[PDB]
Structures are given as C-alpha cells and as structure tokens.
Design a protein around this ligand. Structure first.
Ligand SMILES: Oc1cc(-c2ccc(F)cc2)c(-c2ccc(F)cc2)nc1O
Ligand SMILES: [Mg+2]
Ligand SMILES: [Mn+2]
Ligand SMILES: [Mn+2]
Length: 202
C-alpha cells in the first residue's frame, strides 16, 4: 500500500488530549514530534495505556475496589489510581511527593506512572515492541527499590508484572491488549509498523 505519515496516524488515532500531552512532554525533554515521530507515537501509546489502566477503577463507600464502566460514577466514589504520567515535571513530582509524605511510602528516585490506592504502591507501566522479559529487566534495573511495581505490556498480548501480581482483572487488561493490537494493525495498514517496531532501543 501507500506509505502513510506517522503524524497523520497519531492525529487520527489518538484523542487530541493525549496528543497535546505528548507534544508537551516532548517539548519539555527537548525533542520535536515532527522529527522523532516513532517516539511521538510511542509516547501517545504509553500515555493511553496509563489512562486505560486507571479507567473505571474506583473505591466505594466501604473503602474497597470496584469497577464502574459507565460515565456516571456516584459521588462518594474515589478514583483508585492517581495518574502521574502526562503531568509536566514540576506537577508530577508535586503529586509524588504529596503521596509519599502522606503515606510514608518512600520517595521513588524516578517518576513512576501511577499510584494505586488499593495496593498502596507506585506502578511503572511499560509498553514494548520487543520481548516483555527483556524490557521488564531493563525497567527493573533503574529500580533497586523493589517497592515500585512494574507492569509490562507488549503489542502481541504478552505481559509481565512484578511477583506475577497483575493488579487488574482480565477484562481490564484485555481492553489494553485489544487497543495495542488495534494500534499495531492500523500502523501496519499504513506501512508504519515495521519501522516503529524496529526503532525501539534499550
Ligand atoms: O515507560 C515509559 C516510557 C517512555 C518512553 C520511552 C521511550 C520512548 F521512545 C517513548 C516513551 C516514557 C516517556 C514519556 C514521555 C516522554 F516525553 C518521554 C518518555 N515514559 C514512560 O513511563
Ligand atoms: Mg513522563
Ligand atoms: Mn512514566
Ligand atoms: Mn512507563
């Protein structure tokens, strides 16, 4: 088929909010979305996964965890996850330090992606175009902590998580996997997938 542009793909297939947050993150770290386009798409994909991981998960009146998949969460409910990824540097650390000083959970030395109020731990989300075990070890090596929980997804449906503790039910994780499959399939239709896959480094 005709070769599409990654710019077009990102703008067509991600919510404008996600795209805007990704552009802002790249600007902050000194890279141009129109030049490092595979990186741009990876940032959007990862941000979306972070959002999808948190979506629909609340804590109820009794203080335990439930899923409300409809946009009418009753007002006594609190979000189960705090989302860190997508915030600018200052705000991200502001949220992390808050959680930490408040819970006694010690401060991570690198920004994690989420905080889980049910399991009382930070989470690092990975999304990899390579094998999940190799990417898990890479993430883990920036952590000598042992406290930040790691959850890796690949575009082929494999996952790896710290202590084989997957945190979420099968259906929630399946939503994420389905979305990654869709992203892969659409990129492939535009002849962008091979390059995007091959461009991952570590
Ligand atoms: O797990 C993560 C991966 C990335 C990332 C690394 C390399 C890429 F090519 C793309 C994404 C990021 C990340 C998010 C925003 C940003 F500006 C840079 C890296 N975050 C994360 O939490
Ligand atoms: Mg970030
Ligand atoms: Mn992150
Ligand atoms: Mn991450």
């Amino acid at each position: 088929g005709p070769l599409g542009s990654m710019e077009d793909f990102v703008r067509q297939c991600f919510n404008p909010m996600i795209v805007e947050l990704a552009e802002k993150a790249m600007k902050e770290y000194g890279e141009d979305p129109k030049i490092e386009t595979n990186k741009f798409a990876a940032i959007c994909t990862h941000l979306e996964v972070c959002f999808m991981y948190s979506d629909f998960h609340f804590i109820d009146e009794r203080g335990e965890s439930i899923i409300v998949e409809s946009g009418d969460p009753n007002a006594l409910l609190k979000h189960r996850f705090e989302i860190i990824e997508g915030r600018d540097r200052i705000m991200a650390w502001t949220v992390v330090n808050s959680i930490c000083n408040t819970t006694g959970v010690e401060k991570p030395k690198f920004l994690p992606d989420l905080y889980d109020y049910k399991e009382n731990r930070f989470i690092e989300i990975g999304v990899t175009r390579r094998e999940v075990h190799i990417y898990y070890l890479e993430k883990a090596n920036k952590i000598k902590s042992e406290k930040t929980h790691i959850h890796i997804f690949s575009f082929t449906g494999e996952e790896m998580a710290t202590k084989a503790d997957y945190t979420l039910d099968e259906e929630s994780r399946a939503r994420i996997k389905t979305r990654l499959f869709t992203i892969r399939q659409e990129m492939a239709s535009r002849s962008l997938w091979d390059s995007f896959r091959q461009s991952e480094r570590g």
